C-alpha cells in the first residue's frame, strides 16, 4: 500500500557520533544474556516497567511475559512488544492521547529518542489507525535504529540525553511526557480551585489597643499576684 511520507531528519544528540565514556549519566544497561540469576531478572523487569509504564503497579504487571522471560524463551524485545500491546499501555496511553501525541510518546519510549519533527509524528500516524496498534509496534521494532542501538537483548533507554561537563543534559522523558495532556484533563475537569484564600469571615475587625488601655496591663496582671 501507500508508503510513508519522507520527512527530513533534524539535528539531535543521537544521529551524531559522540565519544561516550563510562559514567553514571549513562543509563545502567539491562541485558537478558548476562542477568542469569533470579534477582537480576527482577531488576531488568523493573527497569523495563519503569520505561514503558512509569512504575507499573501490581495491577499493570503481566504475569505471562515475566514468567516466560524468566524461563528465557521470550526475548526482551518480544517482552517490550508484549508490554506495548498489553491493555494497560493501550488504556493508559493510546486511549487518552490522540494519535500524534501517542506516536510522540511511543517513539520516545521504544526508540529512546525524541521524534525529529512534527511531520514525522504526522507521517507515522497514518499507519496506526489504518493497520492497528500491533502493526505500528511491529513496524517500530523492525526499524534498524532500534536494532543498532539496543538489539534483541537490551532494554531501551534514553540515548545520549546528557553530554559531558553539563550539569543538566536533558529532561528524562519520563518527566517530560506523562499520559494525560491538557486536552484530556480538560475532559476530566481537574482544576477545581482549592479556594482557601480570602474567605471573608464576617466577624468584627480586631482593633489594636490604644496607648493607656486597661487591657495593655491585662497580660502582666494575669502573671502578677
Amino acid at each position: 500500500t501507500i508508503p510513508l511520507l519522507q520527512y527530513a531528519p533534524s539535528s539531535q544528540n543521537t544521529r551524531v557520533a559522540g565519544y561516550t565514556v563510562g559514567g553514571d549519566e549513562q543509563p545502567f544497561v539491562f541485558t537478558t544474556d548476562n542477568v542469569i540469576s533470579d534477582s537480576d531478572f527482577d531488576v531488568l523487569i523493573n527497569a523495563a516497567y519503569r520505561q514503558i509504564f512509569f512504575h507499573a503497579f501490581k495491577c499493570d504487571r503481566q504475569q505471562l511475559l515475566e514468567s516466560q522471560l524468566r524461563n528465557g524463551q521470550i526475548t526482551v524485545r518480544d517482552f517490550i512488544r508484549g508490554l506495548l500491546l498489553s491493555e494497560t499501555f493501550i488504556d493508559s496511553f493510546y486511549n487518552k492521547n490522540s494519535n500524534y501525541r501517542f506516536v510522540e510518546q511511543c517513539i520516545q519510549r521504544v526508540l529512546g529518542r525524541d521524534p525529529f519533527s512534527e511531520q514525522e509524528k504526522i507521517a507515522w500516524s497514518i499507519v496506526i489507525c489504518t493497520k492497528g496498534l500491533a502493526a505500528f509496534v511491529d513496524q517500530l521494532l523492525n526499524t534498524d535504529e532500534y536494532m543498532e542501538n539496543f538489539g534483541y537483548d537490551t532494554v531501551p533507554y534514553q540515548r545520549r540525553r546528557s553530554l559531558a561537563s553539563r550539569e543538566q543534559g536533558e529532561i528524562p522523558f519520563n518527566i517530560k511526557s506523562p499520559r494525560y495532556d491538557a486536552y484530556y484533563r480538560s475532559q476530566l475537569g481537574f482544576p477545581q480551585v482549592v479556594w482557601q484564600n480570602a474567605v471573608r469571615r464576617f466577624r468584627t475587625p480586631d482593633r489594636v489597643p490604644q496607648a493607656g488601655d486597661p487591657a495593655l496591663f491585662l497580660n502582666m496582671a494575669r502573671s502578677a499576684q
Partner: protein, 162 residues
C-alpha cells in the same frame, strides 16, 4: 474502561477493520444483560443505606479489635467509623456503576488498580472488605437473573481483594 461496546470498538480499532456482524451480536446480547441490569441498579439504589449500615455492623462484629484497639486505621472513635461508612459506600457505589456499565471496567478502574499499595501502606486489611462484600452479597436479596450477575460481580470484587 471495560464495557462490551468499547471492547468491540477496540478490537475493530486495533485490527483496523470496519464494524462487523460479530461486533453487532454483543449489542443485542447486552439486551440479555441490561433488561435486568438497570432494574437491579435501581433496586440497589433503594437498598443502599441499610446495606452499608449492615455491612458496618458485620465488619465490627467479625473483628472486635477494630472497635477496641486505638489507632488511626482502626475505627475506635467516631471518625474512623465515618471513614468506614465512606469506604463501604464507595464499594457499593462502584458495584452499582459496574452493574450499570455492563462490565468490570468502572470497578476495575476506580478501585482495583491501587488497592494493593493502599492496603500495604495504610494498614487496611483486605479481609475487612471481604466481610463487607460478602455481607452485601448475602443481604442484597436480588431475584433471578439479576442476582446471578451480582455474584459473578461481587466475587470478582473479592477476587481482586484477595
Amino acid at each position: 474502561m471495560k464495557t462490551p461496546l468499547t471492547e468491540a470498538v477496540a478490537l475493530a480499532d486495533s485490527q483496523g477493520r470496519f464494524l462487523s456482524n460479530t461486533e453487532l451480536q454483543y449489542l443485542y446480547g447486552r439486551l440479555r444483560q441490561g433488561a435486568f441490569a438497570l432494574e437491579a441498579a435501581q433496586t440497589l439504589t433503594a437498598k443502599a443505606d441499610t446495606l452499608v449500615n449492615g455491612a458496618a455492623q458485620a465488619v465490627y462484629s467479625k473483628f472486635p479489635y477494630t472497635t477496641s484497639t486505638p489507632g488511626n486505621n482502626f475505627a475506635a472513635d467516631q471518625r474512623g467509623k465515618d471513614k468506614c461508612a465512606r469506604d463501604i459506600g464507595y464499594y457499593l457505589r462502584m458495584v452499582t456503576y459496574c452493574l450499570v456499565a455492563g462490565g468490570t471496567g468502572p470497578m476495575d478502574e476506580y478501585l482495583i488498580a491501587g488497592v494493593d499499595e493502599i492496603n500495604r501502606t495504610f494498614d487496611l486489611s483486605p479481609s475487612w472488605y471481604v466481610e463487607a462484600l460478602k455481607h452485601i452479597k448475602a443481604n442484597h436479596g436480588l431475584t433471578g437473573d439479576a442476582a446471578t450477575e451480582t455474584n459473578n460481580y461481587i466475587d470478582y470484587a473479592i477476587n481482586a481483594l484477595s
